[PDB]
Amino acid sequence: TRIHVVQGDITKLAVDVIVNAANPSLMGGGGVDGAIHRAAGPALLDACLKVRQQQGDCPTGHAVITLAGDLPAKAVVHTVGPVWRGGEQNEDQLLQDAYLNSLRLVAANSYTSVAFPAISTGVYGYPRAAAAEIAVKTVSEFITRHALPEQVYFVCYDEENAHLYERLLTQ
Ligand SMILES: Nc1ncnc2c1ncn2[C@@H]1O[C@H](COP(=O)(O)OP(=O)(O)OC[C@H]2O[C@@H](O)[C@H](O)[C@@H]2O)[C@@H](O)[C@H]1O
């Protein structure tokens, strides 16, 4: 009842917090990162540069929160998923960290809902089934233990990722 699968563009979803699958520079990129920067407008990049002055780059697994610009969200949490290098560089733990640290920022800032993209499964090349398992398990445990966020949306950009998530949530 608190976890939903949505098919579409994360930049259109009205939620308190949209999560960005960023890179450590925080200055944007070509996937959902680029889509979020484009939808938010230049204010987002300017906010990310301030964050760089405060705390430098965002290392793999870390998360930072900023304003959301023209997005229909109150804030954007930027996190950096691992690059898949075949499983022996601790990618599973780092992906879990990205989800957990993002959820912690949502809760610490008293936000009630959050939307996640499929972190690391695009250009970072994380096997989709394993990544979704990690997202679902991590989120599930967290909301079992915490009242915030109240609602979590797994935003899937294609039918097949939506199906993996829907199948995982019913197990
Ligand atoms: N508008 C969108 N809404 C929701 N999901 C999207 C959208 N656009 C892309 N996606 C999906 O988000 C998932 C993550 O893919 P990427 O955006 O490639 O992110 P990731 O694999 O974590 O790679 C991060 C790298 O890509 C750059 O954009 C970013 O700066 C970083 O260097 C993929 O399933 C992708 O199809």
Side-chain angles (χ1 to χ4, degrees), residues 1-49 51-136 138-144 146-158 161-166 168-171:
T1 197
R2 289 171 67 192
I3 301 168
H4 306 100
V5 180
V6 181
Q7 251 288 314
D9 183 347
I10 199 171
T11 66
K12 305 312 207 326
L13 192 56
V15 277
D16 284 0
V17 179
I18 286 165
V19 175
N20 183 15
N23 68 83
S25 83
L26 300 173
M27 286 174 200
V32 68
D33 196 0
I36 284 164
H37 271 91
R38 185 108 193 298
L44 190 61
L45 177 56
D46 265 285
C48 290
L49 295 167
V51 167
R52 282 185 139 284
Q53 286 188 133
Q54 296 173 325
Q55 68 100 57
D57 268 19
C58 176
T60 310
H62 193 70
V64 296
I65 194 168
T66 64
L67 54 78
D70 299 326
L71 292 158
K74 294 181 172 163
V76 173
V77 169
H78 313 254
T79 191
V80 175
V83 178
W84 184 253
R85 294 156 87 203
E88 336 294 329
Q89 314 290 166
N90 234 262
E91 302 101 309
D92 60 343
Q93 297 195 343
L94 290 164
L95 187 61
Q96 178 171 51
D97 291 347
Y99 280 97
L100 235 188
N101 287 146
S102 300
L103 287 162
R104 291 165 166 149
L105 290 188
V106 173
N109 288 279
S110 291
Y111 290 119
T112 55
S113 60
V114 57
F116 285 93
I119 295 165
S120 288
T121 64
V123 312
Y124 280 6
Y126 208 116
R128 288 177 139 213
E133 217 186 333
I134 290 161
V136 170
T138 302
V139 167
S140 288
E141 293 190 35
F142 187 93
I143 67 156
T144 296
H146 304 280
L148 296 183
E150 286 171 4
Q151 300 283 317
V152 178
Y153 304 84
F154 283 129
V155 183
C156 295
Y157 202 51
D158 61 63
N161 229 8
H163 176 77
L164 273 166
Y165 273 87
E166 278 162 357
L168 286 164
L169 286 155
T170 62
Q171 279 155 35

